[PDB]
Amino acid sequence: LGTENLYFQSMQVAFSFILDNIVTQKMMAVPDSWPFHHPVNKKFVPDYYKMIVNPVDLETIRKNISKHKYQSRESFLDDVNLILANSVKYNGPESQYTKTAQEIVNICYQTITEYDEHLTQLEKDICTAKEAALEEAEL
Ligand SMILES: CCOC(=O)Nc1cc(-c2ccc(C)c(NS(C)(=O)=O)c2)nn2c(C)nnc12
Numbered sequence: 001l002g003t004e005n006l007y008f009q010s011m012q013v014a015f016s017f018i019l020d021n022i023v024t025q026k027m028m029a030v031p032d033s034w035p036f037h038h039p040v041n042k043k044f045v046p047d048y049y050k051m052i053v054n055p056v057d058l059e060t061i062r063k064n065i066s067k068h069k070y071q072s073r074e075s076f077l078d079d080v081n082l083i084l085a086n087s088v089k090y091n092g093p094e095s096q097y098t099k100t101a102q103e104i105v106n107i108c109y110q111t112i113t114e115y116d117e118h119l120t121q122l123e124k125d126i127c128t129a130k131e132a133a134l135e136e137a138e139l
Contacts, residue, residue: 012068019065019076022111027080028058030103032096036083051090056082058104073112080108 028037039057040048049055056079070076087101 026107
């Protein structure tokens with residue numbers, strides 16, 4: 001009956017959905033983030049792709065997510081971290097581009113963090129319950 005696939009596919013779907021929501025609801029809502037919503041346009045930044053080796057932006061990350069490219073937390077956080085890392089490399093730490101990439105990276109970390117609080121707590125509750133029941137038939 002392919003339970004095992006269905007369970008994994010199902011986990012994929014919920015994950016992508018979560019990632020898609022952090023991107024559009026979080027990272028794209030940072031004020032002054034417009035420039036991070038799309039790939040850096042050569043016509044307005046002709047040096048960009050001479051200095052930047054692995055470029056990324058929030059729209060390309062949405063596309064990846066829509067195609068289930070990110071199968072772990074770390075794979076996703078690798079592309080997110082490039083947002084800040086490419087801004088420091090191209091602009092340095094003093095720039096508004098760097099201040100804004102920082103806000104964007106920040107809220108993705110805060111959001112994934114608070115999520116995991118919630119999971120690891122639900123999980124501990126599940127284990128209490130499981131202990132409790134086993135403790136009751138013994139009595
Ligand atoms: C100060 C000297 O440094 C830089 O030029 N910095 C950067 C400049 C721009 C940038 C400019 C102009 C426009 C119109 C856009 N929008 S688009 C259509 O290219 O997506 C983006 N992005 N950017 C990003 C990301 N990271 N750094 C920069």
